[PDB]
Amino acid sequence: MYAVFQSGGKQHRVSEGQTVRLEKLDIATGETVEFAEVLMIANGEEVKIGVPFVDGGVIKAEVVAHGRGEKVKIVKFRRRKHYRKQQGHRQWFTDVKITGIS
Amino acid sequence: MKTFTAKPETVKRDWYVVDATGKTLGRLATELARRLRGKHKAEYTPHVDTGDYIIVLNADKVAVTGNKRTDKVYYHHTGHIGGIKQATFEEMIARRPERVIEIAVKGMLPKGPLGRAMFRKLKVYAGNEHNHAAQQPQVLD
Amino acid sequence: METIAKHRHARSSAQKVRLVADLIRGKKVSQALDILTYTNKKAAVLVKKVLESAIANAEHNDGADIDDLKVTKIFVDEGPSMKRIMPRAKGRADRILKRTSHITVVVSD
Amino acid sequence: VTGSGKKPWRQKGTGRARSGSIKSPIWRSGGVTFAARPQDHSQKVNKKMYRGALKSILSELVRQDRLIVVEKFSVEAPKTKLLAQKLKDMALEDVLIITGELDENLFLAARNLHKVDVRDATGIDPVSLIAFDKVVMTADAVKQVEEMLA
């Protein structure tokens, strides 16, 4: 049932139904996305690739949320050279629910 | 998606026997350490003792190349005022033939609690009889 | 009922009184009162008088019954220290602390 | 600060941090490094800037419709009760009643009223014109202020 696909400059081994967090997409809050970048599909018989991507495989997903992650603190500190720096960071994400491993 | 880690309670432990008779010390020891650490398993996790139990029988018959039967020395300090005790590879096998493999494996394991935990897995023996026939330890080469 | 009693400003340091109070903890009042009779310490007499008070305290005011009464919470807290000059050799002075303790006992069932 | 210029203890030998006075600001009780002094904060303002500013703020009262210009504005007798009753007709409460001929009857009936100030046409101010919600100016006062600002 499971399938592999490349999204936010990186790949996810996803099953049908389960939610997946991934890097922010230019999509609305409750629209839909099609990944034709599918790298692998597994079942009884595995449809692996001798080329880039499969052939007629498309992962259809529905966008759930559009949040920001946990705040990461960034402390740059140079011992004895009168230098330190502080910086927050909340990375943006997009939860997608998978609704079709073709 | 967080990756898999082998959870101790779920870890499958296998038993093995290795006959060291004529085998090269380092090349045996290495292949032992690889197994004892659990590197061969696809569920390898560095902070868990995934490796297998190994019985090394016929330790005394282990072979060494060149002049290392006489030349290879095993030093150790007694923790005393001037107590440095040495012992050649012959003298080592004459007295304690289990130590030869033990020391060669222990050096190749990691250092620390898990390193010591994965040494416990190893069971060296001077003779050919082993009293672990309960576990059905299968033959390894 | 819990029925507290406590000696505040008890002229004995915490560390010493707290040594006795570790004997009596989750013990029957009758068994605890005995111990302090045969504990050879100044804080035993100091801690007993609080417990023996906490029993009368418990029986008269609230709960009654001496048989079913255990020391549930005993504790010693460090009270105010009285500073004093203790003069030493070569002119130099030290500030010695006459320490006090707050002894509480809680006699429940 | 009161105290002596004695060294509390000598420079060496003691383990203490080398001190020179009981009055030093790093010591408790006495010091304050850069003590204050009485000082004239009255900063200088160019005549033309002051006039220009009045001319400016006095023109925004026309745009914003705060400036209620009127004919003769004077109360009957020195009584706050009356002045209070006559501002109720005009829908006024917070005001700066600027007048040419400063009359005792009016000036003495606006002391106790907190929301009513009665300046003379000569004694208008930058902050006052801005502060008050309306400005009820007398035709003579407009004529005096016109000639004053120019």
Binding site: - | - | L19, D22, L23, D34, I35, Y38, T39 | -
Partner: protein, 55 residues
Amino acid sequence: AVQQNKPTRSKRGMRRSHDALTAVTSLSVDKTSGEKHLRHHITADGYYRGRKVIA
């Protein structure tokens, strides 16, 4: 002489582990009067092994 750098709550506690003093848990009972006392010691009233031997 003199510590290089101060010990902790922890160490101090570890040291005090053995300072905990033990109770008696071994009180006798006089045959006649039935009064509690230390073994091989007389009672408060003045008994030892069921016989008054003191005023």
